[PDB]
Amino acid sequence: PTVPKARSCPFLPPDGIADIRAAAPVTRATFTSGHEAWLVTGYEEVRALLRDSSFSVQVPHKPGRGSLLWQDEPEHTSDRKLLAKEFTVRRMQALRPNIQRIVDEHLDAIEARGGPVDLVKTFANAVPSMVISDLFGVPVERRAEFQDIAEAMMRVDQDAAATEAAGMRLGGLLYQLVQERRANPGDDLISALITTEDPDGVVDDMFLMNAAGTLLIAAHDTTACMIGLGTALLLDSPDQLALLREDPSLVGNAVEELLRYLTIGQFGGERVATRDVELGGVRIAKGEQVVAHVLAADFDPAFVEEPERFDITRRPAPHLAFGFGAHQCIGQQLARIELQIVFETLFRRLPGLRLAKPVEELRFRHDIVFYGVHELPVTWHH
Numbered sequence: 254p255t256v257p258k259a260r261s262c263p264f265l266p267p268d269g270i271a272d273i274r275a276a277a278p279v280t281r282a283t284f285t286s287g288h289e290a291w292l293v294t295g296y297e298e299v300r301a302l303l304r305d306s307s308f309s310v311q312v313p314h315k316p317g318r319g320s321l322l323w324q325d326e327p328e329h330t331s332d333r334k335l336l337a338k339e340f341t342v343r344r345m346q347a348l349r350p351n352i353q354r355i356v357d358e359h360l361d362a363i364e365a366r367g368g369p370v371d372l373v374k375t376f377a378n379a380v381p382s383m384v385i386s387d388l389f390g391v392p393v394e395r396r397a398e399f400q401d402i403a404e405a406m407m408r409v410d411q412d413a414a415a416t417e418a419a420g421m422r423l424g425g426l427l428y429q430l431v432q433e434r435r436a437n438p439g440d441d442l443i444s445a446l447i448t449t450e451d452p453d454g455v456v457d458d459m460f461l462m463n464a465a466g467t468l469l470i471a472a473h474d475t476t477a478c479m480i481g482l483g484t485a486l487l488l489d490s491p492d493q494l495a496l497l498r499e500d501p502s503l504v505g506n507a508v509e510e511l512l513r514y515l516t517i518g519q520f521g522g523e524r525v526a527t528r529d530v531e532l533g534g535v536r537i538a539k540g541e542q543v544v545a546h547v548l549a550a551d552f553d554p555a556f557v558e559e560p561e562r563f564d565i566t567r568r569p570a571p572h573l574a575f576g577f578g579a580h581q582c583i584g585q586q587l588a589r590i591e592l593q594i595v596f597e598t599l600f601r602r603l604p605g606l607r608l609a610k611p612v613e614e615l616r617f618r619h620d621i622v623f624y625g626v627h628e629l630p631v632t633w634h635h
């Protein structure tokens with residue numbers, strides 16, 4: 254029975270998913286090219302699945318060390334403990350000033366051209382990426398290079414040839430970068446990894462490259478998607494945009510509801526048992542595959558009321574946009590501070606911000622290859 258993918262509203266979960274979940278939060282279904290796993294759609298259930306260490310992870314449709322996202326234990330746990338040791342709350346909080354300066358520079362450029370602009374190119378894709386460039390200690394004069402190579406590999410309208418080329422060049426640049434930090438260390442996170450406590454000498458150029466490239470895809474893709482879709486969604490919900498413009502102290506809460514309303518987690522691991530297990534009272538044989546649908550769980554009417562209303566005033570609750578358990582996003586705190594600053598500054602600084610074109614004209618894609626809006630033409634009052 255094939256999982257509903259089709260959207261009659263581009264901001265909302267696929268129409269079928271609600272009926273499936275109400276029937277069977279845990280249930281058999283047929284996938285992409287599938288093949289044919291357990292679909293988990295309930296909030297309690299997706300939470301009990303991600304939480305249970307007797308499932309292991311697999312790339313969704315190969316690692317390796319320091320990339321975390323698809324590593325099994327024991328090395329996911331030790332690799333994560335290594336990275337987490339320099340990639341910390343303080344290093345993340347410490348980045349606020351950078352994040353405001355980068356967001357101001359990009360709004361500065363946009364005010365210079367005047368509108369309309371495409372917010373996706375000129376801002377949503379460029380900020381996350383430049384914040385990673387700072388985190389990696391990329392100097393001012395190497396920044397254009399770093400944007401271009403990162404943007405290039407992220408670009409999705411090209412033959413397999415050119416895509417693979419642009420990735421290989423990213424790999425190559427990050428290798429070059431790890432070596433420059435070996436030669437001339439500073440404060441960035443790559444320097445601090447090179448000196449981390451490492452008894453089994455696990456942190457080698459390859460571990461740094463895997464970990465740096467994971468951080469950077471997380472920013473350049475997921476965070477970028479989340480700024481373009483959420484802007485789009487807010488510029489298409491006047492009641493909410495009004496609350497936000499009267500009372501910007503609601504930004505942090507609007508950021509939390511944007512994450513619950515839009516997060517799909519296409520990238521987050523198929524689980525597999527390990528051994529037998531009951532989830533939601535349903536018997537999962539070891540090693541059948543399990544797909545956690547976090548969008549569905551975040552729209553489970555047992556988790557929040559009227560889950561399809563987009564309401565920036567909801568009480569805080571723990572949504573699952575950042576996963577849960579062993580693999581829960583180790584960057585959620587940088588994502589929450591970037592999003593907070595991005596949205597507070599964009600709406601203050603571009604009064605009247607609105608779509609340039611009516612909303613049925615935007616083009617979306619909703620898969621693993623790509624998730625969000627291809628361009629976001631906006632204008633505002635000059």
Ligand code: HEM
Pocket residue numbers: 303320321322323324333467468469471472475476479512516518520521522573574575576577579580581582583584585587588
């Ligand atoms: C921005 C919106 C983001 C969302 C919605 C998000 C979501 C997630 C999710 C749902 C997971 C777990 C996937 C799974 O369990 O199967 C995850 C993992 C991870 N995220 Fe993010 N993330 C975001 C931003 C970031 C940022 C900014 C970073 C770092 C710069 C980041 C770094 C990572 C890494 C390294 C993992 C794997 C961690 C592990 O497996 O232990 N994420 N992210």
Ligand SMILES: c1ccc(-c2cnc[nH]2)cc1
Pocket residue numbers: 322467470471472475520582
């Ligand atoms: C590949 C690597 C990382 C990610 C990601 C992590 N957190 C958000 N996105 C997505 C794809």
